[PDB]
C-alpha cells in the first residue's frame, strides 16, 4: 500500500515546453503536498508545496494543480528550461506542524532538451 | 505556426498505466487526423485515426480524444502493455480521400515497463 503514486517515471520535453508531472495519492488525511526537486548527485530540496485548503499554488512558472475531491495534483513546469532537468518528488503528509511522516512518492525525472 | 506538434518527445509508463501522448495542430483546415505506431527499426503502420467531425474514437484500448475548438488531440494508450514500446506519431491532413499532404509531427517514443 504505497500512497503517493507519481507519473509519469521519464519525461523529456522541449525548452519552452509545458511539462505536466502528476501525481494521485489514497490517504483522505493528506493536507499537505511539498514537491521536492533533485538534481543529479544531490538530496531532495523543497521546490513548492499546496495545502488541501486551495486548488493551485503559482510560483514563477511553476503550478501546483490539486483537486482534493479526486486526490490528484500535478505540478506544471511552464517553459521547461534545461536547468529544470532534475527529478520531482511528491510527498503527502497528512499535517504541517505536528509530526505526522511525510509520504514520499517514486519520482518523476525530467529532461528538457533545448 | 507549427504545423504539428507532439508533446512529449518521449516518456517512460509502468505497465498497466494509461499513457498520453499529446499533439496540437496549427491549421485550421486539417480534417484528418492518423496516428501511427513506429517500432525500433521498422516503418510506421497506421494505428488509429480520428476526423474533424468525430471527437473521440476507440480502437480497444486505445483513444484519440480530439479538441478541434483548441486544435488540441491525444492518444491514449490503456494498460499500457510493455509491448506498446515505440514511437509513436501524430499526422494531420486537410482531407482524407483526396490526395492531400500528410503533415507529419514527430513523435514520442512510449517505453513502457513492468
Known amino acids: 500500500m504505497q500512497q503517493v503514486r507519481q507519473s509519469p517515471q521519464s519525461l523529456t520535453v522541449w525548452e519552452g515546453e509545458t511539462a505536466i508531472l502528476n501525481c494521485s495519492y489514497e490517504n483522505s488525511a493528506f493536507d499537505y503536498f511539498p514537491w521536492y526537486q533533485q538534481f543529479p548527485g544531490e538530496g531532495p530540496a523543497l521546490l513548492i508545496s499546496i495545502l488541501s485548503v486551495s486548488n493551485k499554488k503559482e510560483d514563477g512558472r511553476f503550478t501546483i494543480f490539486f483537486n482534493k475531491r479526486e486526490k490528484k495534483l500535478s505540478l506544471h513546469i511552464a517553459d521547461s528550461q534545461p536547468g529544470d532537468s532534475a527529478t520531482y518528488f511528491c510527498?503527502?503528509?497528512?499535517?504541517?506542524?505536528?509530526?505526522?511522516?511525510?509520504?514520499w512518492g517514486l519520482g518523476t525525472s525530467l529532461v528538457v532538451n533545448p | 505556426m507549427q504545423q504539428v506538434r507532439q508533446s512529449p518527445q518521449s516518456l517512460t509508463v509502468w505497465e498497466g498505466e494509461t499513457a498520453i501522448l499529446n499533439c496540437s495542430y496549427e491549421n485550421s483546415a486539417f480534417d484528418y487526423f492518423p496516428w501511427y505506431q513506429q517500432f525500433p527499426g521498422e516503418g510506421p503502420a497506421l494505428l488509429i485515426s480520428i476526423l474533424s467531425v468525430s471527437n473521440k474514437k476507440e480502437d480497444g484500448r486505445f483513444t484519440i480524444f480530439f479538441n478541434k475548438r483548441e486544435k488540441k488531440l491525444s492518444l491514449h494508450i490503456a494498460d499500457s502493455q510493455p509491448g506498446d514500446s515505440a514511437t509513436?506519431?501524430?499526422?494531420?491532413?486537410?482531407?482524407?480521400?483526396?490526395?492531400?499532404?500528410?503533415?507529419?509531427?514527430?513523435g514520442t517514443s512510449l517505453v513502457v515497463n513492468p
Open positions: 510527498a503527502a503528509s497528512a499535517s504541517f506542524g505536528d509530526n505526522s511522516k511525510l509520504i
